[PDB]
Amino acid sequence: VEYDLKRLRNIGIAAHIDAGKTTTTERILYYTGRIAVTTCFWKDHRINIIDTPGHVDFTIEVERSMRVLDGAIVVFDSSQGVEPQSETVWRQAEKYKVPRIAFANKMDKTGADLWLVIRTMQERLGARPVVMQLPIGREDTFSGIIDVLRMKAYTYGNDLGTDIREIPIPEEYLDQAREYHEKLVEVAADFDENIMLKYLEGEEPTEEELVAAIRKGTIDLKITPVFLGSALKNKGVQLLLDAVVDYLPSPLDIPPIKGTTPEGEVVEIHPDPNGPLAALAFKIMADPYVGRLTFIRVYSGTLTSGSYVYNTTKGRKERVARLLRMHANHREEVEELKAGDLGAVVGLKETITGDTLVGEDAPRVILIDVAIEPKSQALARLAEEDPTFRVSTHPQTIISGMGELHLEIIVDRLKREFVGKPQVAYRETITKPVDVEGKFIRQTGGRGQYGHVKIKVEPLPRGSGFEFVNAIVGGVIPKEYIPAVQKGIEEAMQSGPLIGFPVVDIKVTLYDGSYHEVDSSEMAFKIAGSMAIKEAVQKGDPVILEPIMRVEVTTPEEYMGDVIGDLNARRGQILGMEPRGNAQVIRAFVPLAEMFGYATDLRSKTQGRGSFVMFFDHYQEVPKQVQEKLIK
Numbered sequence: 001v002e003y004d005l006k007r008l009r010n011i012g013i014a015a016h017i018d019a020g021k022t023t024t025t026e027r028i029l030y031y032t033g034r035i036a037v038t039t040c041f042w043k044d045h046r047i048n049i050i051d052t053p054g055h056v057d058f059t060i061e062v063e064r065s066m067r068v069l070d071g072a073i074v075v076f077d078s079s080q081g082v083e084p085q086s087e088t089v090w091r092q093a094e095k096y097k098v099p100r101i102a103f104a105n106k107m108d109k110t111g112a113d114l115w116l117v118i119r120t121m122q123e124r125l126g127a128r129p130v131v132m133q134l135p136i137g138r139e140d141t142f143s144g145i146i147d148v149l150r151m152k153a154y155t156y157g158n159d160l161g162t163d164i165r166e167i168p169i170p171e172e173y174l175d176q177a178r179e180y181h182e183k184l185v186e187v188a189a190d191f192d193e194n195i196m197l198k199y200l201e202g203e204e205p206t207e208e209e210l211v212a213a214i215r216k217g218t219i220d221l222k223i224t225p226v227f228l229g230s231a232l233k234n235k236g237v238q239l240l241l242d243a244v245v246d247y248l249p250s251p252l253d254i255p256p257i258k259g260t261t262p263e264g265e266v267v268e269i270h271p272d273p274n275g276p277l278a279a280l281a282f283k284i285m286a287d288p289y290v291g292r293l294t295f296i297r298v299y300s301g302t303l304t305s306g307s308y309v310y311n312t313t314k315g316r317k318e319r320v321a322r323l324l325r326m327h328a329n330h331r332e333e334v335e336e337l338k339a340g341d342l343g344a345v346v347g348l349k350e351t352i353t354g355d356t357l358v359g360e361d362a363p364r365v366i367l368i369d370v371a372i373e374p375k376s377q378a379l380a381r382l383a384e385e386d387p388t389f390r391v392s393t394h395p396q397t398i399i400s401g402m403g404e405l406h407l408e409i410i411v412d413r414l415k416r417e418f419v420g421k422p423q424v425a426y427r428e429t430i431t432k433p434v435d436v437e438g439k440f441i442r443q444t445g446g447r448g449q450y451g452h453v454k455i456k457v458e459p460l461p462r463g464s465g466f467e468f469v470n471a472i473v474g475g476v477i478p479k480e481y482i483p484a485v486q487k488g489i490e491e492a493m494q495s496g497p498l499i500g501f502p503v504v505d506i507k508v509t510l511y512d513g514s515y516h517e518v519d520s521s522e523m524a525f526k527i528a529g530s531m532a533i534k535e536a537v538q539k540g541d542p543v544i545l546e547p548i549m550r551v552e553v554t555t556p557e558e559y560m561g562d563v564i565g566d567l568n569a570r571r572g573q574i575l576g577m578e579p580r581g582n583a584q585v586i587r588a589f590v591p592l593a594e595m596f597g598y599a600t601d602l603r604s605k606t607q608g609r610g611s612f613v614m615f616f617d618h619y620q621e622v623p624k625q626v627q628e629k630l631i632k
Contacts, residue, residue: 020232047245218248455509471509506537
């Protein structure tokens with residue numbers, strides 16, 4: 001027992017609400033247990049069920065769940081083979097090379113057709129599905145299940161799990177079974193010479209040889225075993241578990257994690273339990289009792305309860321208080337988890353998500369501007385984990401950042417778990433130097449105020465910041481007011497003359513002005529300060545800056561032309577492309593303003609088998625034809 005880096009099946013049930021992700025989890029977990037990272041045992045192995053995002057899209061969150069897992073059981077809804085949805089989910093496991101197997105769920109629901117799945121998987125995804133098992137009974141008849149590798153049936157006696165008897169294949173499926181068993185002994189062959197030499201001879205091979213070779217190829221991305229059953233009817237669950245132990249890679253099967261070490265250089269973090277530790281923080285979940293739980297993954301070394309760790313990605317030092325293994329039914333406080341395994345280190349503050357946690361003796365290694373925004377309790381927690389969004393100032397409630405409506409998730413991680421105007425991040429700038437002037441002649445009723453400055457606004461290199469300098473010689477504007485001025489100015493850059501966005505990249509030089517020996521004030525040189533600007537922005541040929549992005553749309557070659565065409569309409573600058581195994585990805589530079597709704601546009605133009613992703617690339621003007629629209 002204890003541990004073996006070998007007996008470690010780190011998995012995630014990559015699916016969707018519907019395909020039956022949860023119940024494939026509920027049911028898996030129910031059986032282990034008898035005979036954000038749950039765990040348990042199955043026939044000598046520790047199975048680690050690293051919860052997956054499963055909200056169809058949204059990558060950074062999806063991605064994270066993908067680089068911390070090893071297998072990936074993709075469950076398709078039998079009633080419809082690769083429904084557009086399951087495809088992208090596949091696509092994610094594709095982009096990350098995630099070894100996987102597949103479950104032909106709902107194998108008793110009307111639509112039910114194993115082959116419809118295999119057919120589609122072979123067609124649309126273009127993967128080489130092997131055929132591990134055959135169902136007995138049809139859809140609303142679905143009783144037993146035929147294992148074509150060992151040649152034996154499993155007749156589930158009911159929709160509970162209170163009955164199950166191994167049986168010799170009922171002769172009604174003797175031939176069909178025997179046909180598929182041979183296609184199997186044949187795929188094996190591609191992967192194991194020794195087995196082919198026995199195929200060419202009618203000499204059936206060893207079960208190991210078979211199951212072992214089928215194992216090599218899966219872990220190799222050359223095939224994708226397929227199993228079938230029914231979660232909510234309790235047909236095929238156990239077998240799905242043996243599949244996991246049977247063909248999924250353990251931590252030493254995958255390829256070692258690179259990791260940045262200073263002096264740069266990227267290196268190899270292997271799963272050595274007797275070496276210097278290196279962990280990663282992937283998920284944080286506040287706990288009602290015990291509180292803020294950090295969910296780690298131990299890449300190198302061993303982590304022991306009560307140990308001083310050091311968080312490379314943040315400077316802090318941390319005392320890993322105690323440790324916890326979440327279980328379906330009972331948390332499990334433990335004394336140490338060596339490289340390969342994962343869990344909860346309770347008591348951590350300062351440390352976040354995506355953070356590397358080394359040892360105080362180990363060698364230290366580190367393993368967007370949020371451009372869109374709408375309008376006490378909540379926001380602090382939803383800020384516990386999510387180094388992405390931002391609680392921000394501005395003229396007044398503005399959750400801000402990242403991918404369209406991931407904002408909305410915060411909204412349903414708010415008003416559910418706990419508006420309007422999703423807009424772009426424009427800026428404003430002058431294009432030609434302008435020299436100006438402010439004045440303020442008030443009587444305020446009884447106390448005369450006065451302030452008059454003369455300035456010179458100029459364009460500064462895109463990227464340069466703000467610039468204030470003084471030309472006032474031997475006071476004409478008494479040294480005391482200059483600051484009231486720099487502040488009227490500093491307020492003006494909040495809301496540009498045009499569309500009212502942050503005036504940027506300018507060089508304000510104060511050079512002349514005037515004052516009254518008693519009528520002046522501070523609030524008078526702040527007023528004229530904030531006039532000298534607004535005028536001087538609307539009088540230096542004001543522009544509007546905006547976020548040209550960098551998209552990553554993925555179309556199976558099938559629509560790959562009306563995309564590169566509609567993409568074009570997006571003021572887009574397609575620059576390159578590459579083929580992602582099956583389909584093809586076409587990167588581009590589409591001006592952020594041109595993309596709201598885009599989810600849907602790509603949905604349509606491709607039978608929803610399309611997925612884009614975008615990361616803010618930069619700023620640059622927008623030509624009059626746009627600015628003229630924008631300013632209207």
